[PDB]
Amino acid sequence: VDVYGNPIRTQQLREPQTSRLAGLAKEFAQHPAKGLTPAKLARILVEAEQGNLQAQAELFMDMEERDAHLFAEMSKRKRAILGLDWAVEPPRNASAAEKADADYLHELLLDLEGLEDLLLDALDGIGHGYSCIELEWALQGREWMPLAFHHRPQSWFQLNPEDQNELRLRDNSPAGEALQPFGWIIHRPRARSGYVARSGLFRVLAWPYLFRHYATSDLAEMLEIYGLPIRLGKYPPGTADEEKATLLRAVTGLGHAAAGIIPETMAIDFQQAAQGSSDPFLAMMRQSEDAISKAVLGGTLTSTTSQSGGGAFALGQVHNEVRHDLLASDARQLAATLSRDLLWPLLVLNRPGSPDVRRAPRLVFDLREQADITSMAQSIPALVNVGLEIPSAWVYDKLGIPQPA
Amino acid sequence: VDVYGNPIRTQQLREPQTSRLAGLAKEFAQHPAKGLTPAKLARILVEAEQGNLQAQAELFMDMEERDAHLFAEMSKRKRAILGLDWAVEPPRNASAAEKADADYLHELLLDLEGLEDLLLDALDGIGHGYSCIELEWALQGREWMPLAFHHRPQSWFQLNPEDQNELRLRDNSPAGEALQPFGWIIHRPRARSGYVARSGLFRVLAWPYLFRHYATSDLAEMLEIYGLPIRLGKYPPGTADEEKATLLRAVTGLGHAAAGIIPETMAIDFQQAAQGSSDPFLAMMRQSEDAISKAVLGGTLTSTTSQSGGGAFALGQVHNEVRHDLLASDARQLAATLSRDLLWPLLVLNRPGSPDVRRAPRLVFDLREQADITSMAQSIPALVNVGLEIPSAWVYDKLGIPQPA
């Protein structure tokens, strides 16, 4: 069975759950970001709270695509995880059989192509609040294998009417369809405590995005109007339609044309077009960008930048507060999700027996922080000459150097 | 067969797939960037989402050509990869036969001309979202060889109506044509999770490009109008057409001409031409350029520049955060694509047997970061005098010095 105890039947693993839903694969995103107003955004969020996640997912995708600063921040945050070395470790004080199981799982993950793509797809749940990856199960003789990992759009799911924390497929029915066991890797990182609909970071970031969009569009319009002044022509009674058209064309082309002549009975008045500055717009854009930076990566390095300054402890100063905390949180949550969803089916299908769930191997990301070799290498000799018996295992582990074999 | 399991037939390798499509080679780009408005750009993107990639590809090419800042950023990013040393390594704990296969593949890649051009062509997928390179297969006796690598424009492909993630050639039919196995090296880097149409970076960068283009054009127009003032001449009733023309020419040339005389019954009024500054335009250009820099290369070194400051750890400070992450991501994705597309056909055609796919050799890029030799050389003697047995293999690998032979 799975970790949650639901019965597992190997018959349903031959075909993906969504195969019998050919309607989903033919859908196109509705792009709800175009022509978006604060009222529309509020309605979208409220409806999403009630189980209509399609519009929210499409809006989040548009928001990711249309904002360069937000996209850069999210990409940097995800690439931070994608570059971490990982390993599979056996449970606490594991036995020989458990160690062998962990070693086999580690070897299987090493030789499993598409792991990086799986991690990238799973990390989308950081912003979207939940990411679902469908599994393709195949048999190369007697051992089950994940053939491929398919990322399904968040717009394909909904909320259970009887449960606000349980996701279901959109199968044209009011209650949707329950997710098949062992058929998905659902990643639901928890930045804030609440239901799944409210758990996305883009829900926090939506309003600054709209503020920045409005400011940028208004600035573009004002830059378009800038330049020549608006000038209005006046004509006396008894001016025919042809003369009216001639005066109109003359006024229209007068800005580009340096000189022109009109009868003394006519008049042209040059009125202010748009006089001001870009200061308000740019102030709003900077405020929104700082808010986005703080919300995504913390207000110590991105928005209120940590500035330059090297040194042996500079790495620690830059990392440990804020950056290390965020990195560790994301890595630990991703590792927990993976150990729950991918490691367990492999252990319970590819190996004999029914090992207890509490003793399953856990995937661990390498969060080791580079320690100053020079300072500590200076420090050891004094301590050892004093008489302290420092274990070599601690040194080898903390320095990153492996133990002799 | 290929990695995806599709049957492979050596009969079709004698001729390129596109040879029977002589119509494609005679096409010319439509240049959709000229006369581009936000509505046109939105329509282009939406249509591309639906499988019309021709217009999107041509727009991306124009965008690359017409923006100097964006072009410089993309060229720098790609040249970063092009300068990395690479090697082919055998699988985990490989056997003698596998080691020989890996060595032969490494020798073949070393002596294969046009590798750098292949890497450059593949890296175009970073911005375009997908790059297709056609292969020319030839037999120098008993061993198949890639005669040349041909990069085909992204405008030559489309989306499968029944699948939004599968590309097909444009053969005048609604469904296009499936890509021949072993006939292409398709590189599809994944910056964001989604379909192939939405996966390009230029899709994110399009809007800042349009903002900058509008600002620059408006500034150029305003600089053209700047200088002399617009001056309007007025004439009384009873002024004949010849006198009207004389007054018009006098007004037209009055700005260049320092002095002129008119009857007291006439009048010339000098009105403001264009009074303001370049501040709004330049502010918009700077905002767009900063957005492009952040989106392409990260907001730590390019847009918000890291500034000067040397030191032993300066290399790490500049690289590890942002620059190292991006370099490693791009290099790993390119290596995976190459190992999938080019290494496998060579292994399965140029050598006997049917080696298992999981044990295929993998191309690896040298991502080793220069480590401070002096500090660490100071550090070792203390540790070794303490009693730690540090392996020499770790030292030789990390320093870049090769092991004695």
CSV table of N, CA and C in Angstrom, one decimal, chain B residues 64 68-83 120 123 126 292-293 296-298 301-303 305 323 326-327 330:
chain,number,residue,atom,x,y,z
B,64,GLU,N,15.8,39.7,-31.6
B,64,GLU,CA,17.2,39.5,-31.4
B,64,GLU,C,18.0,40.4,-32.2
B,68,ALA,N,20.2,45.8,-29.3
B,68,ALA,CA,21.6,45.6,-29.0
B,68,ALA,C,21.9,45.1,-27.6
B,69,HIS,N,21.2,45.6,-26.6
B,69,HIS,CA,21.4,45.1,-25.3
B,69,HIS,C,20.9,43.7,-25.1
B,70,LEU,N,19.8,43.3,-25.6
B,70,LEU,CA,19.3,41.9,-25.5
B,70,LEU,C,20.3,41.0,-26.3
B,71,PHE,N,20.7,41.4,-27.5
B,71,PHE,CA,21.6,40.6,-28.2
B,71,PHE,C,22.9,40.4,-27.5
B,72,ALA,N,23.5,41.5,-26.9
B,72,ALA,CA,24.7,41.3,-26.1
B,72,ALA,C,24.5,40.4,-25.0
B,73,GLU,N,23.4,40.5,-24.2
B,73,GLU,CA,23.2,39.6,-23.1
B,73,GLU,C,23.1,38.2,-23.5
B,74,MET,N,22.4,37.9,-24.6
B,74,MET,CA,22.2,36.5,-25.0
B,74,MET,C,23.5,36.0,-25.6
B,75,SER,N,24.3,36.8,-26.3
B,75,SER,CA,25.6,36.3,-26.8
B,75,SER,C,26.5,36.0,-25.7
B,76,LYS,N,26.6,36.9,-24.7
B,76,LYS,CA,27.4,36.6,-23.5
B,76,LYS,C,27.0,35.3,-22.8
B,77,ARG,N,25.7,35.1,-22.6
B,77,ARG,CA,25.3,33.9,-21.9
B,77,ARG,C,25.7,32.7,-22.7
B,78,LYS,N,25.5,32.7,-24.0
B,78,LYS,CA,25.9,31.5,-24.8
B,78,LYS,C,27.4,31.3,-24.9
B,79,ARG,N,28.1,32.4,-25.1
B,79,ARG,CA,29.6,32.2,-25.1
B,79,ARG,C,30.1,31.7,-23.8
B,80,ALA,N,29.4,31.9,-22.7
B,80,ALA,CA,29.8,31.3,-21.4
B,80,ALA,C,29.8,29.8,-21.5
B,81,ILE,N,28.8,29.2,-22.1
B,81,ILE,CA,28.8,27.8,-22.3
B,81,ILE,C,29.8,27.4,-23.3
B,82,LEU,N,29.9,28.1,-24.5
B,82,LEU,CA,30.8,27.7,-25.5
B,82,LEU,C,32.2,27.5,-25.1
B,83,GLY,N,32.7,28.2,-24.0
B,83,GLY,CA,34.0,28.1,-23.6
B,83,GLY,C,34.3,27.1,-22.5
B,120,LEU,N,26.4,26.0,-30.4
B,120,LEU,CA,25.9,27.3,-30.6
B,120,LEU,C,24.4,27.3,-31.1
B,123,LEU,N,22.0,26.1,-28.4
B,123,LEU,CA,21.8,27.1,-27.4
B,123,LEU,C,20.7,28.1,-27.8
B,126,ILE,N,17.4,28.3,-25.9
B,126,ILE,CA,17.3,29.1,-24.7
B,126,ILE,C,16.3,30.2,-24.9
B,292,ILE,N,15.5,43.3,-18.7
B,292,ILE,CA,16.1,42.3,-19.6
B,292,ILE,C,17.4,41.7,-18.9
B,293,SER,N,18.2,42.5,-18.3
B,293,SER,CA,19.4,42.0,-17.7
B,293,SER,C,19.1,41.0,-16.6
B,296,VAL,N,17.7,37.7,-18.1
B,296,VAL,CA,18.7,36.9,-18.9
B,296,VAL,C,19.8,36.4,-18.0
B,297,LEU,N,20.4,37.2,-17.2
B,297,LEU,CA,21.7,36.9,-16.5
B,297,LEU,C,21.6,37.0,-15.0
B,298,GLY,N,20.4,37.4,-14.4
B,298,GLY,CA,20.3,37.5,-13.0
B,298,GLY,C,20.5,38.9,-12.5
B,301,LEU,N,24.6,40.7,-10.9
B,301,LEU,CA,25.8,41.0,-11.6
B,301,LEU,C,25.6,42.0,-12.7
B,302,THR,N,24.5,41.8,-13.4
B,302,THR,CA,24.3,42.6,-14.7
B,302,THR,C,23.5,43.9,-14.4
B,303,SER,N,22.2,43.7,-13.9
B,303,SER,CA,21.4,44.9,-13.7
B,303,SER,C,21.8,45.6,-12.4
B,305,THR,N,24.7,45.6,-10.6
B,305,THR,CA,26.0,45.1,-10.8
B,305,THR,C,26.7,44.8,-9.4
B,323,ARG,N,25.5,33.2,-10.9
B,323,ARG,CA,26.3,32.9,-12.2
B,323,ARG,C,26.5,31.4,-12.3
B,326,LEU,N,23.2,29.5,-13.0
B,326,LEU,CA,22.8,29.5,-14.4
B,326,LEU,C,23.7,28.8,-15.3
B,327,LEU,N,25.0,28.9,-15.1
B,327,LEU,CA,26.0,28.1,-15.9
B,327,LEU,C,25.7,26.6,-15.8
B,330,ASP,N,22.4,25.5,-17.5
B,330,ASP,CA,22.4,25.5,-19.0
B,330,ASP,C,23.3,24.4,-19.4
